[PDB]
Amino acid sequence: HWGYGKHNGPEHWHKDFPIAKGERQSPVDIDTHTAKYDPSLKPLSVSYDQATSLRILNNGHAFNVEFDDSQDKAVLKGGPLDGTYRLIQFHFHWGSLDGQGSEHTVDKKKYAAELHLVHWNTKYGDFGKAVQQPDGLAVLGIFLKVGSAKPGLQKVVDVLDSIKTKGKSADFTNFDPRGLLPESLDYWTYPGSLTTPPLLECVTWIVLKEPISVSSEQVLKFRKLNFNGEGEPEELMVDNWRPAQPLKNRQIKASFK
Ligand SMILES: NS(=O)(=O)c1ccc(NC(=S)Nc2cccc(I)c2)cc1
Ligand SMILES: [Zn+2]
HSE toward the beta carbon, residue 76, CA cutoff 13 A: 26
Nearest CA among 1, 257, 37, 219 for reference residue 115 = 219
Task: Tell me the C-alpha distance between 66 and 74, whole Å.
Answer: 12
Q: CA–CA distance from 223 to each of 43, 92, 116, 151, 237 (Å)?
A: 35, 11, 17, 19, 6
Q: Mapped to the 3 state alphabet, what secondary structure does the chain carry?
A: CCCCCCCCCCCCHHHCCHHHHCCCCCCCEECCCCCEECCCCCCEEEECCCCCEEEEEECCCCEEEEECCCCCCCEEEECCCCCCEEEEEEEEEECCCCCCCCCCEECCECCCEEEEEEEEEHHHCCHHHHCCCCCCEEEEEEEEEECCCCHHHHHHHHHHHHHCCCCCEEECCCCCHHHHCCCCCCEEEEEECCCCCCCCCCEEEEEECCCEEECHHHHHHHCCCECCCCCCCCCECCCCCCCCCCCCCCCCEECCC
Nearest CA among 73, 189, 85 for reference residue 127 = 85
Q: Which method resolved this structure? A: X-ray
- Tell the residue nearest (CA) to atom 4 of ligand 1: 116
Q: How far is CA 66 from the centre of its chain?
A: 13
Task: Determine if ligand 1 sits within 6 Å of the CB of residue 242.
Answer: no
Q: Under a CB-based contact definition with an 8 Å cutoff, are residues 184 and 208 in contact?
A: yes
Task: Tell me the C-alpha distance between 5 and 235, whole Å.
Answer: 10
Q: Under a CB-based contact definition with an 8 Å cutoff, are residues 112 and 146 in contact?
A: yes
Task: Tell me the C-alpha distance between 91 and 165, whole Å.
Answer: 16
What separation in Å is there between the alpha carbon of 100 and the centre of ligand 2? 15
Give backbone dihedrals phi and psi of 130, rounded to 5 degrees, phi first: -65, -35
Residues 234, 97, 216, 108, CA torsion sign:
negative
> Which residues sit opposite 206 in a β-bridge?
140, 189
Neighbour count for residue 158 (Cβ, 10 Å)? 11
Structural domains in the chain, CATH included, are 1-257 (3.10.200.10)
- Tell the residue nearest (CA) to atom 7 of ligand 1: 194
Task: Determine if ligand 1 sits within 6 Å of the CB of residue 195.
Answer: yes
Neighbour count for residue 216 (Cβ, 10 Å)? 11
Q: How far is CA 35 from the centre of its chain?
A: 21
Task: Tell me the C-alpha distance between 181 and 177, whole Å.
Answer: 8
For ligand 1, what atom is nearest to the CA of residue 26?
A: 3
Nearest CA among 194, 176, 188 for reference residue 119 = 194
